[PDB]
Design a protein around this ligand. Structure first.
Ligand SMILES: [Zn+2]
Length: 635
RNA sequence: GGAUCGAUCGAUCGAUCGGCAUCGAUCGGCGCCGAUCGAUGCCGAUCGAUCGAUCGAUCC
């Protein structure tokens, strides 16, 4: 039922000016959006009809919004549909838009439509609502819609432009340190989303706080381990692994430039990735030993990264969790290859494993962070026996690992399997949520706590300046609400005109396609896969090979999660077909009826025929060559 | 497969402050010392811009 708080938040969009409204709940935002839909469609007289469009970023919020919009719009004679990825092909989108009003499409569909040529203008819609509207920052699908609207408006061909109301729970601060910078960022958001009103609660603050989460920050800066025997053993393992890895390259230190590469840190992982991408462009002209040293090194660097991830886990989660992580990696990599390099590294791991299992089983080497995490979990489960603890870690490799520690520690018995009837849920990004714990990271039942366990004070100072930024954002929101309307309209017109001018400034022209027929090699294996003359791009994004000689150069493996993206259908994952390479290459797909595997340039390297230089690319847009479109008449 | 966002970290550049090292100008005392100003190199603290890596999430 609509209360005075929702009507006070929904007041400035009744007049007909765009808003960036802020409600801290989700159901209140949904009710306000439904109220704006009701008042906006009911204001039209006979002979005209409105086309209020709702945008939802993710699939579950799209399904929730589609269910709510279908449930409420039953007694008003209003039709409701929503389009998504599994709905995109089905029937053509122009017939859905032209024969309905309340489209709840996800924004990437509209971005693809306005890029294609369908939906010739944004003036068909009469109101536009943006769920989670502070995402309109840079190159977002919401921002692509807003760039289209600003090019339609400021170009001089503006017609019946839609109202551009928003929906969020936080305006955001960004890279702002002073109050003028926060005001500049909020004005930049208001100009990019093209609004002159920021609606927030100013009078009915008493009934607002009945659903507000209101966290209680309880930071605990607690020191790390002292007796690092496992770190000593595996650090010696990286030391002699890197020393034996220098028997094939005499300039491994000259490949990278990131110094202070201490083990167990993200800086070491960055050094490992940089030295892997530095070795991956190897051009020794023997072309038979080159595959051998590239395969050997790649095994060395994947072992090094696996060891570094083992100490990152052992720093955060248990010692034994690092041991099972390394044992699982060696068990999965033993079946992939049986050469001298793999056997040598595996027999080195079993020659260290006899002391590794002795060190890991020692109960005097437990992590102190896990000890006081168990202590605080014990005391909050003792205070209340129905606490749902959310646990935020940095990586998914910890997500099961801490869970195994939850399945390993005998002092706790009220913790239950909840890896994401579940007592504790451990995840990485986002319900009751009575307790939140952030383990080295940076709902209902009000009175919640948000513990933060870090071995560094930088995260504590970041959360302190985050609280200062929240207070300063609320102060800048009140300051912008105190301003006059016409000066704010002139300000957002100036800011969005400067934004449109600097957007048209960064319009790079078409790059030229390189005329040579370049050859693609494996990342880890350096085998002849295909030439670029046989590389056809299908829908200006996806690339494939129609070569008959390419068909025997790969092998198949069953896909764990097939899912029909766009008009394609996944069937299997393709891999390199050799003795001990087994490198990922792409994915087996069906377009309409053919089975032509689509590759990714991420797991490939590009070599030219004349110069012979090997180039490393991560996205297909960075690759500039003769992009011949895929013709179905050939194969 | 392709795109998008967020957190941490790295590289480069610029700005503010402090410290070390070096070269010149003025004043005072008995060639030496104290003070300030001007310039260069390095490091530390903070901020901004660009690029990248990892991790996570999202969409098509
Ligand atoms: Zn291969």
């Amino acid at each position: 039922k609509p209360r005075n708080y929702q009507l006070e938040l929904a007041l400035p969009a009744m007049k007909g000016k765009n808003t960036i409204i802020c409600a801290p709940t989700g159901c209140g935002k949904t009710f306000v959006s439904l109220l704006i839909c009701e008042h906006h469609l009911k204001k039209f007289p006979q002979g005209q009809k409105g086309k209020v469009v709702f945008f939802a970023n993710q699939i579950p919020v799209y399904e929730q919004q589609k269910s709510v919009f279908s449930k409420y719009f039953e007694r008003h004679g209003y039709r409701v549909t929503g389009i998504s990825g599994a709905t995109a092909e089905n029937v053509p989108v122009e017939q859905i838009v032209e024969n309905n009003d309340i489209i709840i499409l996800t924004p990437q569909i509209l971005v693809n439509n306005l890029k294609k040529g369908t939906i010739p203008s944004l003036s068909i819609f009469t109101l536009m609502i943006f769920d989670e509207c502070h995402n309109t920052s840079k190159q977002h699908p919401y921002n692509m819609i807003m760039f289209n609207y600003l090019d339609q408006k400021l170009g001089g061909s503006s017609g019946p432009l839609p109202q551009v109301i928003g929906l969020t729970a936080s305006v955001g601060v960004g890279d702002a340190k002073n109050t003028d910078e926060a005001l500049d960022y909020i004005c930049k958001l208001c100009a990019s989303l093209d609004a002159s009103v920021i609606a927030t609660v100013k009078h009915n603050l008493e009934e607002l706080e009945q659903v507000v989460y209101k966290p209680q920050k309880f930071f605990r800066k607690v020191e790390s381990r002292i007796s690092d025997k496992f770190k000593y053993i595996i650090a010696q393992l990286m030391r002699d692994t890197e020393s034996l890895a220098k028997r094939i390259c005499k300039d491994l230190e000259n490949l990278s430039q990131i110094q202070n590469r201490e083990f167990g840190t993200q800086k070491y992982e960055q050094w490992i990735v940089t030295v892997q991408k530095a070795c991956m462009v190897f051009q020794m002209p023997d072309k038979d030993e080159e595959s051998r040293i590239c395969k050997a090194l790649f095994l060395y660097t994947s072992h090094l990264r696996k060891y570094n991830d083992a100490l990152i886990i052992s720093e955060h989660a248990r010692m034994k969790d690092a041991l099972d992580y390394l044992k699982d990696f060696f068990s999965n990599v033993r079946a992939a290859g049986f050469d001298e390099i793999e056997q040598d590294l595996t027999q080195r791991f079993e020659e260290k494993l006899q002391e590794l299992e002795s060190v890991s089983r020692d109960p005097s080497n437990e992590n102190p962070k896990l000890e006081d995490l168990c202590f605080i979990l014990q005391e909050e489960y003792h205070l209340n026996p129905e606490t749902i603890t959310i646990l935020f870690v940095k990586t998914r490799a910890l997500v099961d690992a801490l869970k195994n520690w939850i399945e390993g520690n005998p002092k706790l018995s009220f913790l239950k399997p909840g890896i994401l009837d579940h007592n504790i849920l451990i995840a990485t990004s986002v319900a009751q949520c009575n307790l939140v714990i952030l383990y080295e990271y940076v709902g209902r039942a009000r009175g919640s706590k948000c513990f933060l366990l870090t071995s560094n004070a930088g995260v504590i100072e970041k959360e302190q300046i985050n609280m200062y930024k929240e207070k300063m954002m609320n102060d800048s929101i009140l300051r912008l609400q105190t301003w006059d309307e016409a000066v704010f309209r002139e300000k957002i017109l100036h800011i969005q005109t400067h934004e449109k001018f600097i957007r048209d400034s960064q319009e790079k022209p078409k790059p030229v396609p390189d005329k040579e027929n370049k050859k693609l090699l494996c990342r880890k294996c350096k085998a002849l896969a295909c030439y670029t003359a046989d590389v056809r791009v299908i829908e200006e994004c996806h690339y494939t090979v129609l070569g008959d000689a390419f068909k025997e150069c790969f092998v198949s493996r069953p896909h764990p999660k097939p899912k029909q993206f766009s008009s394609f259908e996944k069937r299997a994952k393709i891999f390199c077909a050799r003795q001990n390479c087994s490198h990922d290459w792409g994915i087996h797909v069906k377009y309409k009826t053919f089975e032509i595997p689509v590759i990714k340039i991420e797991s490939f390297v590009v070599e030219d025929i004349a110069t012979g230089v090997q180039t490393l690319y991560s996205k297909w847009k960075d690759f500039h060559f003769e992009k011949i479109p895929f013709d179905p008449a050939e194969m």
